[PDB]
């Protein structure tokens, strides 16, 4: 008879159902994203950006779309005040509806794994138990994260193939969305230099790809293996919560 | 007899679960416009 | 003007018989 506060411990040793609840959590987060975007569009007033900005209205997830360059809606109005002709696929409502479609797709993906959890990936081919190879999984995920980081820094930030980010007048009058020249000197660590944010991910994704391939190739020592209990799974959770709340103070500061 | 000789068990299957939930939401969908007026 | 009481009545008429049916279903499917 389990207590109420440990009911998710039935999927310590069931990785398909673990993927199923990862998918369901991701679907719920995307559903919040789409619903908050649509609610904030329906409340939002574009009437005068001179005296009634976004932040007076309590608008929350729209100054992130505007931060990364989504500056147009299907109504024809824009942020700075004028109207733009072509809204394209990617307007505010389109981003919101795309997240709703992601929510439904990840829902239907989440149903399938817990319906069919007993496949042959999650099985030791050597001896016949249900394990998972955590340093190689970490190498795969670090390699993927490095690829997406490098692509985001190279293309979408600097305006190679994406449209750029919001880079503004420091006196707060004439800000707009711009492709950013990545600076590589000592001014790249001044956090008031968007060239630093541009040149960040270029180095970060490359180093992440290198480390990810390193962990795909080599295997750890027995000393660190017993010292960190890498055969267990919950050490990854204890390390990940640590990394997440280290990130949280940075994004709050 | 001090313990009750008529302690009996309620039983509600999944078909009746779906019928009851569908009844409650259909009643809500119908009457909600007239309640909000 | 929308009702002060209407959304409360809607939410109550949703949640109360829903929970009433969920209690009975979980009690039923616990045994079998």
């Amino acid at each position: 008879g389990l207590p109420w506060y440990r009911v998710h411990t039935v999927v310590i040793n069931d990785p398909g159902r673990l993927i199923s609840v990862h998918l369901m959590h991701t679907a719920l987060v995307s559903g919040w994203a789409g619903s908050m975007a649509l609610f904030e569009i329906s409340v939002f007033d574009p009437s005068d950006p001179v005296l009634n900005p976004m932040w007076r209205q309590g608008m929350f997830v729209l100054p992130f779309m505007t931060r990364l360059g989504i500056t147009q809606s299907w109504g024809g109005w824009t942020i700075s005040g004028e109207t733009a002709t072509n809204p394209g696929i990617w307007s505010y409502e389109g981003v919101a509806a795309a997240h709703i479609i992601l929510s439904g797709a990840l829902f239907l993906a989440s149903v399938w794994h817990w319906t069919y959890w007993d496949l042959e990936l999650f099985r030791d081919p050597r001896t016949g138990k249900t394990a998972l190879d955590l340093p190689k999984i970490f190498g795969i995920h670090l390699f993927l994260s490095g690829l997406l980081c490098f692509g985001f820094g190279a293309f979408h930030v600097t305006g190679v193939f994406g449209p750029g980010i919001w880079v503004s007048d420091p006196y707060g009058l004439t800000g707009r969305v711009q492709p950013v020249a990545p600076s590589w000197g000592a001014d790249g660590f001044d956090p008031y230099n968007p060239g630093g944010i541009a040149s960040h991910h270029i180095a970060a994704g490359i180093l992440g790809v290198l480390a990810g391939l390193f962990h795909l190739c080599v295997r750890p020592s027995i000393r660190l293996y017993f010292g960190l209990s890498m055969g267990s799974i919950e050490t990854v959770l204890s390390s990940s919560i640590a990394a997440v709340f280290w990130a949280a103070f940075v994004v709050a500061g | 007899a001090r313990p009750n000789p008529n302690k009996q068990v309620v039983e509600l299957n999944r078909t009746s679960l779906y019928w009851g939930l569908l009844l409650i939401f259909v009643l809500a969908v119908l009457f909600s416009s007239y309640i909000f007026n | 003007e929308v009702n002060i009481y209407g959304l409360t009545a809607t939410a109550l008429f949703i949640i109360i018989p829903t929970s009433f049916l969920l209690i009975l279903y979980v009690k039923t499917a616990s045994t079998q």
Partner: peptide, 30 residues
């Protein structure tokens, strides 16, 4: 305000339709 209540009720009805179709008890034999 009330449009969200309307949409929530319609989507909840469709969700109960979905779970009723796919997550029923299996009608089993003898």
């Amino acid at each position: 305000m009330e449009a969200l209540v309307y949409t929530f009720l319609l989507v909840g009805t469709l969700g109960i339709i979905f779970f009723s179709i796919f997550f029923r008890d299996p009608p089993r034999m003898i």
